[PDB]
């Protein structure tokens, strides 16, 4: 025999370098305030699934059917495919199922798929709000085969019903990638694109708080579409990750998850209030979801500057361009902030308001070491009061 | 306190439905003999990494994987980010090819296939004919049911003669390559890819490796991987799996893999079965059942009744559909992992011949099943 004994076979016994790195990553997740809008803390049940012997399975079916059934129940889809390894892979399945090389696609942005297809962008104005009349004119002008909804840095709510009308008016597909807001949709606090788009994709981590992976959903499609989508996905699925998806999707149906998402939305609003009250500009002047963009043009700061300074105080954000950004995309004039992770670890309005205030202290004094050190200390204290896995 | 994040309530407590399905799979892995050539049993250290908080990360960990991949394979470039072998391959294509380019491969882009004969041996002269006539931008080496050695040096000569890239997908033999007991493509290819879970016995995932290129090439390969983020928990799994593969015991393992495959081959041949190519030089082989009036699908099902798992596979010039086939593909990595040596695999191969000789003899099926279960019980995978 040659049994692999779990008590004798662990990382700390065998691979000290890896173990030290893993320990330091747990410490980082605990003692940093994570405001990257795509970040979250998955449950220990998701982690248990991902650590399981399902990694050995070549593809089982019951585990997969639970994920599929739960995806359909949660989002009200008549079709779900839980196999994609990532949101990007889900998206690529959709493109290859429905598009030909060199087709025109209308996407949205701030004012490889780009290499294979002709992507025309609808750019949100300095107003920071979608203008559906203008979107309809771009659609009419360019006659895309597909309009793609979903954008990583929009703080407004997208009217998917209206987008479907625009798509239909020119015979295009509406594809919505809801990766950036899926958890809010799952909770009923943001509108669902499943009844309006021809196909929908998402990641399962981010606001859904599950494992990293993809999902394709649809409602009202024909057998033929569903068949094409299935065939475009692959090269088998990660069954341990699919188990992760199954348990995450059930967690998403808990009343606690609805309360959590309501808190996510309140928290993002409370942070916006502070930034505005401290003299910072927020794109659109508000948020209606979990995230927002701080426009630093009037401060003569770059997003890269802001991000580095905040990082020195154990606050993680990402840079992001603003509408008609006067700076290059490598630099930007904005940062994007979201509440899911801090909310997940127990921060409510008081904490996020205090945090926003500290961020304003940093940005007001971006090369003052003492401010940075003071704020770092406060961040560490707040992190201790609100531990993650406890 | 965060009710959803505290460790109190595990999957069994929370989601009995899911837990039951997970634990059935666990018991299935113990109670069946697995001869699907792409399957293995990864270590508990790999699973521990996959179960870690690294799933929440949006880099010392990645460097460890990169360094260990380069060391194991003798490469001066590695990318450990791909989610799968397929994504690794896709990265290479999108890095080096333009849409509609011509490509040559074994069994978006104009593909010219090269087809090994009934002899079950690669015809380098036919490969050369196709390459030199059609002038592909890239020749792709590596194929899933091939039991022979491949002359990677010769493929590079062919590629070099027409100015083409040589890409080798070594997924189907990577662990043997790593242990030095199968020809190494890394010195000869422009770029190589692999999965991390079959003969490497690691997590499911992809890898890109290369040597002898400049940073410009390596930058292109990096840029091509995500056309989002890596799975850092899986990458930690890769790091520890790659370290395990550097142990002298891993080479011993692969030597036993190769020896066991040859041993099973000898039984099939001696029992009147035909083996594509007449033998093996690696961990797998293909039985050609045409002369038995058997389909691969039916052979797969018959063996499954006795708790022996194989997969159907087309043979050269298969008279049957690809969904039916006239062959089965058998590999030794998983049985060897759980401790089978030559004596055990020889006995196993005899039982398989007993079933296939008389698929409808339920007495034989039941006899073999009981022996299979006894054998599985004394070779537990995990404890």
UniProtKB/Swiss-Prot annotation, chain B:
Its main location: cytoplasm. GO terms for molecular function: glycine hydroxymethyltransferase activity; pyridoxal phosphate binding. Keywords: Amino-acid biosynthesis, Cytoplasm, One-carbon metabolism, Pyridoxal phosphate, Transferase. It comes from Salmonella typhimurium (strain LT2 / SGSC1412 / ATCC 700720). InterPro entries: PyrdxlP-dep_Trfase (IPR015424), PyrdxlP-dep_Trfase_major (IPR015421), PyrdxlP-dep_Trfase_small (IPR015422), Ser_HO-MeTrfase (IPR001085), Ser_HO-MeTrfase-like (IPR049943), Ser_HO-MeTrfase_PLP_BS (IPR019798), SHMT-like_dom (IPR039429). It is found in: Cytoplasm. The record marks 197 as: Plays an important role in substrate specificity. The gene is glyA. This is Serine hydroxymethyltransferase.
């Amino acid at each position: 025999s040659n049994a692999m004994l779990k008590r004798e076979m662990n990382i700390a016994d065998y691979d000290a370098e890896l173990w030290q790195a893993m320990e330091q990553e747990k410490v980082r997740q605990e003692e940093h305030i994570e405001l990257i809008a795509s970040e979250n803390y998955t449950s220990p049940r998701v982690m248990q699934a991902q650590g399981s012997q399902l990694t050995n399975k070549y593809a089982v079916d019951v585990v997969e059917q639970l994920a599929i059934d739960r995806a359909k129940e949660l989002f009200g889809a008549d079709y779900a495919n839980v196999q994609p390894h990532s949101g990007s892979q889900a998206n690529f399945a959709v493109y290859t199922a429905l598009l030909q090389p060199g087709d025109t696609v209308l996407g949205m942005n701030l004012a490889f798929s780009g290499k294979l297809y002709n992507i025309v962008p609808y750019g949100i104005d300095e107003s920071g709000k979608i203008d559906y009349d203008e979107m309809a004119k771009l659609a009419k002008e360019h006659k895309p085969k597909m309009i793609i909804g979903g954008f990583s840095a929009y703080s407004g709510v997208v009217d998917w019903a209206k987008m479907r009308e625009i798509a239909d008016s020119i015979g295009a597909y509406l594809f919505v990638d809801m990766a950036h807001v899926a958890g809010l949709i799952a909770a009923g606090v943001y509108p669902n694109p499943v009844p309006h788009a021809h196909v929908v994709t998402t990641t399962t981590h981010k606001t859904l708080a599950g494992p990293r992976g993809g999902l394709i959903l649809a409602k009202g499609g024909d057998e033929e579409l569903y068949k094409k989508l299935n065939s475009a996905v692959f090269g088998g699925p990660l069954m341990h990750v699919i188990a992760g998806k199954a348990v995450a999707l059930k967690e998403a149906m808990e009343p606690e998850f609805k309360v959590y998402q309501q808190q996510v939305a309140k928290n993002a609003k409370a942070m916006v209030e502070v930034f505005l009250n401290r003299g910072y500009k927020v794109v659109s002047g508000g948020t209606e979801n979990h995230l927002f963009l701080l426009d630093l043009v009037d401060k003569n700061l770059t997003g890269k500057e802001a991000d580095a300074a905040l990082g020195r105080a154990n606050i993680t954000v990402n840079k992001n361009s603003v509408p008609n950004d006067p700076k290059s995309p490598f630099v930007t004039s904005g940062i994007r902030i979201g509440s899911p992770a801090v909310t997940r670890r127990g921060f409510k309005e008081a904490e996020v308001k205090e945090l926003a205030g500290w961020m304003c202290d940093v940005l007001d004094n971006i090369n003052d070491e003492a401010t940075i050190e003071r704020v770092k200390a406060k961040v560490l204290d707040i992190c201790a009061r609100f531990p993650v896995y406890a």
